[PDB]
């Protein structure tokens, strides 16, 4: 038993941490359990969680020099500068108790850490720097971080439709899939050719891109009905896919109060749980895509740059001054930002006239990520989870619902923009003839509750009913692709009955559906024409030999998945965008959307001949071939998948300390099977094929008989290098294996290993 002083906490705390290292949370009042949740998150996460704050508010240049002042200013830029009284109302009606309490239990850390410096994380020493106070304020104006778009899209489209002209629409299509697939429609008065993508994206990566050190400077879910259980009571699944490091995105956390009762995950810098139960509903979520972003263009004045063309005037541009502190300089930096009305400017050019804004809901009230679930929390049925997803903000998220009575539900939610005249695929112009009027009501978004085939499954793919009225308002066009719903949807369907442990092999799930479609192609290729004469070639034969008897299973021990994955990521989809379009189309869209690309494979019709399309697909596997054998110990010992799929959780600072710092700061848990099709998404970069992103924290929850849920995290619950807790959770996520999420007071104290006791001061 650890003791410590909680100036600001209202009755005694304590927290048992359990021996997967999950802290449970007794409270005596209502906020008291935030001020808890708050100094065991900085317990254990104070330096990620401080970075966040850092990198928020734009103050990463005071510690780490003048390579930082460039993205601090950017930060300022995109913070929530909107009414408060609002903000605080946005997520429910006591946000703003919580977070102050949540804050105060941070700030007792960070006093802490200060009286008992051997209680300062190593980080902080390694830097030379000291954790920061937080304000309430803090927690609901950082908004950067949240998934979001498409800004990034409109950039890319318009430079295509620049570069490509005539052939703008046929190059798009294979860039990116459209779902619903319309034609987009370049916006009256916008000329592609006047948006600079290096300058707009540089600008906008400066403003949203998480914390980063370079040497230079130094999802699924699903809800199954009790009657297909075998439990007879329902199970709700959820595996969000999100970027992978150490320590992790999420961090599972137990809070325990008069009238509170949440277990689960969510950011550690956020408090509360967006992501688990409260003993009476459950919920899980996967990114639902309203488009969220649009960027405007505008024309300024020759006699007066920072003024702009809107509605016949000359608006001048709001001009807000920032001192930004710079280590090794003994005066801030004075910087000025300019906003139009409808967001920060990114960009601007005077030679042209021209000025580029980023017209983001989220930086609209109410759009600190994850933070509505203030209002559900405490929901104990249908109605009131319906309710509190009526004000959910950002990002936007498909919710699966269930209850202890056997419900089960699906709400997407999330701030949905109005475009009475434009479909935001597009920049549009700024001078007022497009302008968002305003936003949808989630009843305007389809739902489900208790559907008649007893299960929902969600997985970033358009979700809404064509025949539903809300496939007709232009919610949002670019979806992720579909091949992960497909399979589970394929795989729920076909199990009438199903238990915890079918869920959870289904979140471990390998087949590739673009794999499956890949070699349905390879079978029909023709031995004729210049195909015929890469038949003959030894290189070409071993390769086909091999994808010949795999059934697309990505496994970490198989060969043909190994050169599957580097065939369709580095060679096959490339090889065919070139033989379908022109250079300079084909180098901005690089190896396009897998799902039009396939697409092109199955029917080349208008793209290419039958025979030159297996010409390319034999082209570019001999070449896939060839790599696979440089990365291989010897060609007649071929490198598994696993072999290159390296499953490491990189440290935001491995790239500035030593090999033995960075040892201690990552974190590999050895070769894993999967892509960023399968169900266990595993997500890689192409140059190593190593591990970026995928299911970190996983749950499968009995609902209702609550101590049997199951839960994994990676790589471990703590922070902190020198603690047990920094990986041992890796190994049991690397093996698809869980750990049980205790939350009865009997299994809470029966699986503890510590204890922790906060007392008022
Ligand atoms: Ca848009």
Same mark, same amino acid.
Not at 183 to 209: I, N, Q, R, S
Not at 236 to 265: E, F, K, M, T
Not at 664 to 677: E, H, L, R, T
Not at 704 to 710: I, V
């Given at each position: 038993?650890?003791?410590?002083?909680?100036?600001?906490?209202?009755?005694?705390?304590?927290?048992?941490?359990?021996?997967?290292?999950?802290?449970?949370?007794?409270? !005596?009042?209502? $906020?008291?359990?935030?001020?808890?949740?708050?100094?065991?998150?900085?317990?254990?996460?104070?330096?990620?969680?401080?970075?966040?704050?850092?990198?928020?508010?734009?103050?990463?240049?005071?510690?780490?020099?003048?390579?930082?002042?460039?993205?601090?200013?950017? #930060?300022?830029?995109?913070?929530?500068?909107?009414? &408060?009284?609002?903000?605080?109302?946005?997520?429910?009606?006591?946000?703003?108790?919580?977070?102050?309490?949540?804050?105060?239990?941070?700030?007792?850390?960070?006093?802490?850490?200060?009286? *008992?410096?051997?209680?300062?994380?190593?980080?902080?020493?390694?830097?030379?720097?000291?954790?920061?106070?937080?304000?309430?304020?803090?927690?609901?104006?950082?908004?950067?971080?949240?998934?979001?778009?498409? @800004?990034?899209?409109?950039?890319?489209?318009?430079?295509?439709?620049?570069?490509?002209?005539? *052939?703008?629409?046929?190059?798009?299509?294979?860039?990116?899939?459209?779902?619903?697939?319309?034609?987009?429609?370049?916006?009256?008065?916008?000329?592609?050719?006047?948006?600079?993508?290096?300058?707009?994206?540089?600008?906008?990566?400066?403003?949203?891109?998480?914390?980063?050190?370079?040497?230079?400077?130094?999802?699924?879910?699903?809800?199954?009905?009790?009657?297909?259980?075998?439990?007879?009571?329902?199970?709700?699944?959820?595996?969000?896919?999100?970027?992978?490091?150490?320590?992790?995105?999420?961090?599972?956390?137990?809070?325990?109060?008069?009238?509170?009762?949440?277990?689960? #995950?969510?950011?550690?810098?956020?408090?509360?749980?967006?992501? !688990?139960?409260? !003993?009476?509903?459950?919920?899980?979520?996967?990114?639902?895509?309203?488009?969220?972003?649009?960027?405007?263009?505008?024309?300024?004045?020759?006699?007066?740059?920072?003024?702009?063309? $809107?509605?016949?005037?000359?608006?001048?541009?709001?001009?807000?001054?920032?001192?930004?502190?710079?280590?090794?300089?003994?005066?801030?930096?004075?910087?000025?930002?300019?906003?139009?009305?409808?967001?920060?400017?990114?960009?601007?050019?005077?030679?042209?006239? %021209?000025?580029?804004?980023? /017209?983001?809901?989220?930086?609209?009230?109410?759009?600190?990520?994850?933070?509505?679930?203030?209002?559900?929390?405490?929901?104990?049925?249908?109605?009131?989870? %319906?309710?509190?997803?009526?004000?959910?903000?950002?990002?936007?998220?498909?919710?699966?619902?269930?209850? /202890?009575?056997?419900?089960?539900?699906?709400?997407?939610?999330?701030?949905?923009?109005?475009?009475?005249?434009?479909? !935001?695929?597009?920049?549009?112009?700024?001078?007022?003839?497009?302008?968002?009027?305003?936003?949808?009501?989630?009843?305007?978004?389809?739902?489900?509750?208790?559907?008649?085939?007893?299960?929902?499954?969600?997985?970033?793919?358009?979700?809404?009913?064509?025949?539903?009225? =809300?496939?007709?308002?232009?919610?949002?066009?670019?979806?992720?692709?579909?091949?992960?719903?497909? %399979?589970?949807?394929?795989?729920?369907?076909?199990?009438?009955?199903?238990?915890?442990?079918?869920?959870?092999?289904? *979140?471990?799930?390998?087949?590739?559906?673009? #794999?499956?479609?890949?070699?349905?192609?390879?079978?029909?290729?023709?031995?004729?024409?210049?195909?015929?004469?890469?038949?003959?070639?030894?290189?070409?034969?071993?390769?086909?030999?091999?994808? %010949?008897?795999?059934?697309?299973?990505?496994?970490?021990?198989?060969?043909?998945?190994?050169?599957?994955?580097?065939?369709?990521?580095?060679?096959?989809?490339?090889?065919?965008?070139?033989?379908?379009?022109?250079?300079?189309?084909?180098?901005?869209?690089?190896?396009?959307? =897998?799902?039009?690309?396939?697409?092109?494979?199955?029917?080349?019709?208008?793209?290419?001949?039958?025979?030159?399309?297996?010409?390319?697909?034999?082209?570019?596997?001999?070449?896939? &071939?060839?790599?696979?054998?440089?990365?291989?110990?010897?060609?007649?010992?071929?490198?598994?998948?696993?072999?290159?799929?390296?499953?490491?959780?990189?440290?935001?600072?491995?790239?500035?300390?030593?090999?033995?710092?960075?040892?201690?700061?990552?974190?590999?848990?050895?070769?894993?099977?999967?892509?960023? @099709?399968?169900?266990?998404?595993?997500?890689?970069?192409?140059?190593?094929?190593?591990?970026?992103?995928?299911?970190?924290?996983?749950?499968?929850?009995?609902?209702?008989?609550?101590?049997?849920?199951?839960?994994?995290?990676?790589?471990?619950?703590?922070?902190?290098?020198?603690?047990?807790?920094?990986?041992?959770?890796?190994?049991?996520? =690397?093996?698809?294996?869980?750990?049980?999420?205790?939350?009865?007071?009997?299994?809470?104290?029966?699986?503890?290993?510590?204890?922790?006791?906060?007392?008022?001061?």
């Amino acid at each position: 038993t650890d003791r410590y002083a909680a100036p600001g906490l209202e009755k005694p705390a304590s927290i048992l941490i359990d021996r997967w290292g999950v802290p449970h949370i007794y409270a !005596g009042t209502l $906020y008291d359990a935030f001020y808890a949740q708050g100094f065991i998150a900085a317990r254990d996460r104070l330096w990620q969680i401080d970075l966040w704050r850092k990198r928020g508010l734009g103050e990463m240049a005071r510690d780490f020099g003048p390579a930082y002042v460039d993205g601090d200013r950017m #930060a300022r830029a995109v913070l929530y500068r909107g009414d &408060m009284y609002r903000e605080w109302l946005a997520y429910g009606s006591d946000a703003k108790r919580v977070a102050e309490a949540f804050v105060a239990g941070v700030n007792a850390y960070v006093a802490l850490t200060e009286a *008992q410096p051997e209680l300062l994380p190593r980080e902080f020493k390694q830097l030379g720097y000291k954790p920061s106070r937080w304000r309430a304020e803090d927690i609901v104006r950082i908004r950067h971080h949240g998934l979001t778009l498409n @800004f990034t899209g409109e950039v890319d489209r318009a430079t295509l439709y620049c570069q490509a002209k005539e *052939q703008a629409a046929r190059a798009d299509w294979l860039r990116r899939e459209l779902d619903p697939p319309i034609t987009p429609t370049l916006p009256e008065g916008l000329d592609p050719c006047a948006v600079p993508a290096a300058a707009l994206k540089k600008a906008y990566t400066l403003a949203t891109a998480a914390a980063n050190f370079p040497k230079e400077a130094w999802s699924n879910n699903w809800v199954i009905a009790g009657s297909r259980t075998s439990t007879g009571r329902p199970i709700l699944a959820n595996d969000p896919h999100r970027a992978h490091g150490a320590p992790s995105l999420r961090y599972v956390s137990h809070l325990n109060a008069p009238g509170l009762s949440v277990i689960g #995950a969510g950011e550690p810098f956020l408090p509360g749980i967006s992501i !688990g139960h409260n !003993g009476t509903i459950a919920f899980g979520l996967t990114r639902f895509y309203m488009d969220q972003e649009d960027l405007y263009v505008y024309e300024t004045d020759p006699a007066q740059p920072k003024s702009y063309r $809107y509605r016949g005037r000359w608006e001048p541009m709001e001009t807000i001054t920032e001192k930004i502190t710079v280590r090794g300089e003994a005066e801030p930096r004075t910087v000025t930002i300019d906003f139009t009305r409808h967001g920060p400017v990114l960009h601007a050019d005077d030679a042209s006239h %021209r000025a580029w804004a980023l /017209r983001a809901a989220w930086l609209d009230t109410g759009m600190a990520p994850y933070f509505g679930s203030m209002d559900y929390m405490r929901a104990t049925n249908w109605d009131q989870f %319906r309710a509190a997803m009526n004000r959910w903000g950002a990002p936007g998220e498909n919710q699966v619902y269930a209850d /202890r009575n056997g419900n089960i539900g699906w709400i997407p939610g999330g701030l949905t923009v109005i475009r009475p005249n434009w479909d !935001g695929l597009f920049p549009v112009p700024g001078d007022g003839r497009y302008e968002w009027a305003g936003y949808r009501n989630m009843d305007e978004l389809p739902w489900a509750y208790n559907p008649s085939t007893g299960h929902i499954v969600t997985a970033n793919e358009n979700n809404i009913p064509p025949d539903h009225p =809300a496939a007709k308002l232009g919610v949002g066009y670019e979806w992720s692709d579909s091949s992960r719903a497909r %399979r589970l949807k394929s795989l729920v369907a076909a199990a009438p009955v199903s238990s915890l442990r079918d869920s959870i092999a289904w *979140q471990n799930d390998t087949v590739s559906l673009p #794999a499956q479609r890949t070699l349905a192609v390879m079978r029909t290729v023709g031995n004729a024409g210049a195909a015929a004469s890469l038949l003959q070639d030894p290189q070409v034969q071993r390769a086909v030999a091999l994808l %010949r008897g795999w059934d697309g299973n990505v496994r970490a021990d198989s060969v043909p998945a190994a050169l599957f994955e580097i065939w369709f990521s580095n060679h096959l989809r490339q090889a065919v965008v070139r033989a379908a379009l022109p250079e300079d189309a084909a180098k901005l869209v690089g190896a396009g959307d =897998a799902a039009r690309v396939l697409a092109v494979l199955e029917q080349p019709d208008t793209w290419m001949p039958t025979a030159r399309r297996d010409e390319v697909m034999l082209t570019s596997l001999k070449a896939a &071939m060839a790599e696979l054998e440089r990365r291989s110990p010897s060609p007649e010992k071929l490198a598994t998948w696993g072999t290159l799929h390296r499953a490491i959780f990189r440290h935001p600072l491995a790239n500035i300390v030593d090999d033995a710092t960075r040892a201690q700061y990552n974190v590999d848990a050895g070769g894993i099977g999967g892509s960023a @099709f399968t169900p266990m998404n595993t997500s890689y970069r192409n140059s190593d094929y190593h591990l970026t992103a995928g299911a970190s924290f996983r749950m499968v929850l009995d609902v209702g008989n609550w101590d049997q849920g199951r839960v994994v995290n990676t790589p471990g619950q703590s922070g902190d290098p020198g603690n047990s807790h920094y990986r041992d959770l890796a190994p049991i996520w =690397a093996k698809g294996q869980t750990f049980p999420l205790v939350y009865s007071r009997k299994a809470v104290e029966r699986a503890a290993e510590k204890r922790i006791e906060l007392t008022p001061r």
